[PDB]
A paper describes a structure:
Clostridium thermocellum has extensive potential in lignocellulose biorefineries as an environmentally prominent, thermophilic, cellulolytic bacterium. Previously, five putative sugar transporters, denoted A to D and L and belonging to the ABC transport systems group, were identified in the genome of C. thermocellum, and the solute-binding lipoproteins (SBP) of these ABC transporters were shown to bind different dextrins by isothermal titration calorimetry (ITC) assays. To gain insight into the structural mechanism of the transporter specificities, 11 crystal structures, both alone and in complex with appropriate saccharides, were solved for all 5 putative sugar-binding proteins, thus providing detailed specific interactions between the proteins and the corresponding saccharides. Combined genetic, biophysical, and structural studies have provided solid evidence that transporter A and transporter B are the major glucose and cellodextrin transporters, respectively, among the five potential sugar transporters in C. thermocellum.
To identify the carbohydrate ligand-binding mechanism of the different Cbps, we successfully solved the crystal structures of unliganded CbpA, CbpB, CbpC, and CbpD, as well as the complex structures of CbpA with glucose and CbpB with cellobiose, cellotriose, cellotetraose, and cellopentaose. A hinge motion was observed between the unliganded CbpB and its complexed structures, and the rigid body rotation angle was ~17°. The complex structures of CbpB with G2 to G5 could be superimposed well, with a root mean square deviation (RMSD) of 0.15 to 0.51 Å. CbpB exhibited a long substrate-binding pocket between the two domains, and the glucose residues at subsites +1 to +3 showed unambiguous electron densities, indicating tight ligand fixations at these subsites. A large number of residues at subsites +1 to +4 are involved in the extensive hydrogen-bond network formed with the cellodextrin hydroxyl groups in CbpB. Furthermore, W90 and W296 lay parallel with the glucose residues at subsites +2 and +3, respectively, and formed aromatic stacking interactions with the ligand. CbpB showed high affinities for all of the tested cellodextrins (G2 to G5), with the highest affinity for cellotetraose (KD = 0.562 μM). The structures of the CbpB-cellodextrin complex revealed that the longer cellodextrins had more interactions with protein until DP 4, which is consistent with its highest binding affinity with cellotetraose.
Residue numbers in the entry: 49 to 454
Write the structure that this text describes.
């Protein structure tokens, strides 16, 4: 049988085994094709995927972050153009924007799953502090008042930090700013995706509101020294009253109960992100699938991609990974009425905004990770007291950098 090689980022608790279980129905019905997944850690994924494209030494297939798809597809001769080979009618239409290069009709990836970041909260902490999550998290300033009530209260054998978020360089630095900028009434780029615009008055108001939560003590300043993975573990250990995180954490916290007796999962809830003056907006992310032009099994690889778009494969990978499907028929399944999953679905469906699918965005995120993290260094007073004016200068500088890339 053809052994399709496939790179995946760590999308679930046991990524390789989980992937293999989801594709077992495919090999059952296609005995000539097996799948060998290889895990590629997120911090190395852009360099490794890019090196695979430029060198010609590549697997048959790789997962690609939705925001990077245009960058890899724009590399001449790197990927197989999928335009016309995939029935787009089956997909949630909003998920297709990242499969194309913006400004063209060229599709170089197939949507695989979507995700957004929602507001997890500890029910016991909110009940003690008199915080009512559905309404007290509904707006910027109601959220802020809620953090004031939650900060420092004693739950279990610890003093809880009201909000815990990472500040260290990783791909989520910009993602965690995104919906504060959108909700303030700003954006990262103009409609054409050719000019950076997040130094606008409204964009800065969202950057100022969010970053100054830590200056005011409502967001845990020491936690800014950590990355997303460390924040997710800390919240799983009960360190924070609230945190903005993706749905995948539900897998880890559920296993923590099954394996360690940590019942955190049973005393947490999730609400949509608070609404800003622009209305509610949320980060829309996810990953697509691509076929390398160097593959010697392009026919078999396309069959596997089509399987991953099937209703049952979309549901089963959602159940194990907690990512949201991109195929409309998958939402006929009652699984997405789950109390936690339904929140992510409603939020990304109604309010999810994705970045412009331009070839330069991958290089833009490299700069964002380094540039916007300097705002957190300003908050942490690494070099001098905090000042908003220094944040404005960082944002102006980062914007200039992005403008050179575009
Ligand atoms: O910006 C590049 C892409 O990022 C995607 O978000 C991913 C984050 O970059 C990544 O840090 C995070 O990693 C999770 C992992 O999914 C999970 O299995 C593990 O348990 O915890 C990690 C965090 O500590 O995963 C997300 C989602 O894959 C965007 O979705 C994508 O649009 C974007 O191109």
């Amino acid at each position: 049988s053809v052994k399709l090689t496939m790179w995946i980022m760590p999308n679930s608790d046991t990524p390789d085994q989980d992937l293999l279980k989801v594709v077992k129905p495919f090999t059952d019905a296609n005995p000539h094709i097996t799948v060998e997944p290889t895990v590629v850690d997120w911090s190395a994924a852009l360099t490794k995927i890019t090196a695979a494209a430029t060198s010609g030494e590549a697997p048959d297939i790789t997962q690609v972050g939705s925001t990077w798809t245009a960058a890899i597809g724009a590399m001449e001769g790197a990927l197989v153009e999928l335009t016309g080979k995939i029935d787009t009618s089956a997909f949630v239409e909003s998920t297709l924007q990242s499969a194309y290069i913006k400004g063209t009709d060229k599709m170089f990836g197939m949507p695989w799953f979507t995700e957004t970041r929602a507001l997890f909260y500890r029910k016991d902490a909110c009940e003690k502090a008199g915080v009512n999550p559905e309404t007290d998290f509904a707006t910027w300033d109601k959220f802020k008042d809620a953090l004031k009530k939650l900060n420092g209260i004693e739950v279990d054998g610890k003093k809880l930090a009201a909000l815990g978020m990472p500040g260290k360089n990783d791909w989520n630095v910009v993602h965690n700013f995104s919906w504060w900028i959108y909700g303030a009434g700003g954006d990262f780029v103009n409609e054409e995706g050719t000019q950076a615009t997040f130094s606008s008055e409204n964009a800065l108001k969202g950057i100022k509101f969010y970053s100054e939560l830590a200056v005011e003590g409502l967001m845990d300043e020491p936690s800014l020294e950590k990355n997303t993975s460390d924040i997710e573990s800390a919240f799983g250990d009960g360190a924070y009253a609230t945190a903005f995180m993706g749905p995948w954490v539900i897998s880890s916290y559920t296993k923590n109960k099954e394996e360690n007796g940590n019942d955190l999962i049973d005393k947490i809830g999730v609400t949509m992100v608070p609404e800003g003056p622009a209305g509610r907006y949320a980060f829309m992310g996810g990953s697509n699938l691509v076929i390398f032009n160097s593959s010697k099994n392009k026919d078999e690889a396309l069959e596997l991609l089509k399987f991953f778009a099937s209703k049952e494969a979309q549901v089963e990978y959602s159940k194990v990974s907690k990512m949201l499907p991109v195929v409309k028929a998958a939402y006929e399944d009652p699984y997405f009425e789950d109390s936690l999953m339904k929140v992510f679905k409603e939020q990304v469906d109604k309010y999810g905004k994705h970045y412009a699918s331009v070839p330069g965005w991958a290089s833009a995120e490299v700069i964002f990770s380094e540039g916007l993290s300097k705002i957190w260094d300003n908050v942490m007073e690494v070099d001098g007291a905090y000042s908003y004016d220094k944040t404005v200068q960082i944002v102006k500088d980062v914007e200039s950098q992005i403008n050179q890339i575009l």
